[PDB]
């Protein structure tokens, strides 16, 4: 237990029903990572297949504002997912500690959040369960979205995180008896998030579910005097009771407030860079570590998420 | 060492936003009690009125399976509510620790739960917010319903945890956008509770709000092989999606399973007996302690909830 694969395991930073998360250090590059450790012997067949599908989703989410998977290590009883470590905690906890962000700083965070979520939506991944645990900060105050489209069953907080933390962010369709599944649901949640960044508090709240419900269905929220008119007008594009009338993220990216100070740099859909698996400076380093040319090209081209692809990625950070 | 009125204060057992709960011992009788301590100076005028309304509610609920108020002490700054202490913890935690109850045991607790809740409803007190914390066990495994009809504002809960434990017991009308204020809501929650007593498990679960909401709206739940036909039939009378068709408590009390083994003893609405405030044996002990008959007769006959009425009640326990 002091090591797994090419990682020295350090402090346990969370423990849940079916998973633990440890901080760790990659031995070959010296980088810090977070390792999620899932006990497979405690999962039935359905839960086991959900896990693997979700691992496949983590492999295809590659965006500077979404927690990146670096490596998978699997044994008959345990699954280890070696992940990017975001050391800055939850955005909402930051807001409770430091109060509201001025509009300039809220804008630089909200541009990152809209880009990351739109990017998921474009690949047909919708979360429908946004809560404070999903929005993290790294050491440089960049947004890192965690566990997006990744079941609570495999998290440290488990179901309780959703029941305790999801209602304030739930779209009004949750209490209207019909579907709850398209991207429009996450668009409502992102309006709630914008409101928290600019005010430091929740637009809808109550002492019990019935009261929270009332406020969410009514759709009315306080606009403080310090909030610009342009921010107020953006909130109106997210917080619409009729999901059909709600704005889409690709449209909302053209909003005046969103692009203030970005006259020459308008927000638009993220486009993945072409993945460079042929950087010779890093390949030469890996050859120096004892991998062969041929092993490196095979693990990179088949994108194996093994010792090699992780070392290549971590050498690039 | 520390005391308030006739009570030696022992350990702190709950720490909430506006309220603390301490175990205490009544020094004249040696009986243990739980004291809710509310600091008035942190409340504004309206919630202060709320608190007092809620004290007036505790004063008229007198049922053997509802936490009883013994005394009120009030200073300039602080309100002390001296309450019955239920030392056996929450029923859901007992089921988690010990597994399901056999039908005969489940039936004895459920008859207590149904009698207590129908009694509240008759006095027009509806909770609509049932959670595991509401159902406690005393040292003899009798049910003690706590905080029923009272705001989460004054419970230990803890501020931001108000939504944690409600969704699994919530009636489907919450998610359909329908009125959520009548006794029918608590009837659905008592079906959830029956199911937990006999199976050890919740009937509707999910890993997030969306999945839980979808099980609740669909209304279907697993019947384990060991559950009797009569228990399954009783469940069908509570877990009815349509709140008008849903059975009422007065009708349900007549059910075959509720009454098995109670031939000469059909469950029916609680009738509070006349309080015997004329027990000369207790009156004599109290005169010995320093009280006078005359003043004893005054506090009891006017039910003042002062040190006399508490001592008289505690002596009968």
UniProtKB/Swiss-Prot annotation, chains A, B:
Any one GO MF annotation of this record: protein serine/threonine kinase activity
Record's subcellular location: Cell membrane; Cell projection, Dendrite; Cytoplasm
Residue sites binding ATP per the record: 13-21, 36
GO cellular component, one term: dendrite
Catalytic residues as annotated in Swiss-Prot or TrEMBL: 129 (proton acceptor)
GO terms, biological process: intracellular signal transduction; microtubule cytoskeleton organization; negative regulation of hippo signaling; negative regulation of protein localization to nucleus; protein phosphorylation; regulation of G2/M transition of mitotic cell cycle
Disulfide bond sites: none
Residue intervals of the Protein kinase domain: 7-258
Sequence positions bearing Phosphothreonine: 162
Boundaries of every UBA domain copy: 277-316
Tissue and organ expression note: Ubiquitous.
Keywords noted in UniProt: ATP-binding, Cell membrane, Cell projection, Cytoplasm, Disease variant, Kinase, Membrane, Nucleotide-binding, Phosphoprotein, Serine/threonine-protein kinase, Transferase
Entry similarity comment: Belongs to the protein kinase superfamily. CAMK Ser/Thr protein kinase family. SNF1 subfamily.
Function: Serine/threonine-protein kinase. Involved in the specific phosphorylation of microtubule-associated proteins for MAP2 and MAP4. Phosphorylates the microtubule-associated protein MAPT/TAU. Phosphorylates CDC25C on 'Ser-216'. Regulates localization and activity of some histone deacetylases by mediating phosphorylation of HDAC7, promoting subsequent interaction between HDAC7 and 14-3-3 and export from the nucleus. Regulates localization and activity of MITF by mediating its phosphorylation, promoting subsequent interaction between MITF and 14-3-3 and retention in the cytosol.
Medical condition linked: Visual impairment and progressive phthisis bulbi: An autosomal recessive, progressive disease characterized by poor vision at birth and development of bilateral phthisis bulbi by adulthood.
Quaternary state and interactors: Interacts with MAPT/TAU. Interacts with DLG5 (via coiled-coil domain). Interacts with STK3/MST2 and STK4/MST1 in the presence of DLG5. Interacts with YWHAB, YWHAG, YWHAQ and YWHAZ. Interacts with PKP2 (via N-terminus). Interacts with CDC25C. Interacts with KSR1.
Name the record gives this protein: MAP/microtubule affinity-regulating kinase 3
Species the sequence originates in: Homo sapiens (Human)
Lineage, top ranks: Eukaryota, Metazoa, Chordata, Craniata, Vertebrata
Protein's gene: MARK3
């Amino acid at each position: 237990q002091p090591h797994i694969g090419n990682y020295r395991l350090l402090k346990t930073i969370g423990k849940g029903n079916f998973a633990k998360v440890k901080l760790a250090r990659h031995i070959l590059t010296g980088r810090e990572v977070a390792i999620k450790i899932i006990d497979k012997t405690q999962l039935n067949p359905t839960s086991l297949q959900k896990l693997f599908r979700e691992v496949r989703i983590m492999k295809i989410l590659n965006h500077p504002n979404i927690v990146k998977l670096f490596e998978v290590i699997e044994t008959e009883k345990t699954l280890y997912l070696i992940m990017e470590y975001a050391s800055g905690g939850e955005v909402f906890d930051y807001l409770v500690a430091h109060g509201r962000m001025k509009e300039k700083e809220a804008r630089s965070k909200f541009r990152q959040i809209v880009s990351a979520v739109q990017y998921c939506h474009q690949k047909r991944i919708v979360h429908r369960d946004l809560k404070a645990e999903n929005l993290l900060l790294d050491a440089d105050m960049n947004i890192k979205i965690a566990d997006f489209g990744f079941s609570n069953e495999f998290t440290v907080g488990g179901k309780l995180d959703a029941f305790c933390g999801a209602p304030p962010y739930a779209a009004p369709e949750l209490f209207q008896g019909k579907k709850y599944d398209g991207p429009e649901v996450d668009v409502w949640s992102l309006g709630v998030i914008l409101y928290t960044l600019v005010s430091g508090s929740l637009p809808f709240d109550g002492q019990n579910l019935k009261e929270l419900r009332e406020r969410v269905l009514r759709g009315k929220y306080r606009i403080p005097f310090y909030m610009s008119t342009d921010c107020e007008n953006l909130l109106k594009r997210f917080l619409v009771l009729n999901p059909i009338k709600r704005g889409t993220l690709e449209q909302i990216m053209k909003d005046r407030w969103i692009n203030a100070g970005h006259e020459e740099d308008e927000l638009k859909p993220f486009v993945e860079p072409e993945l460079d698996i042929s950087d010779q400076k890093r390949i030469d380093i890996m050859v120096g570590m004892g991998y062969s040319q041929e092993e490196i090209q095979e693990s990179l081209s088949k994108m194996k998420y093994d010792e090699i692809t992780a070392t290549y990625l971590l050498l690039g950070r």
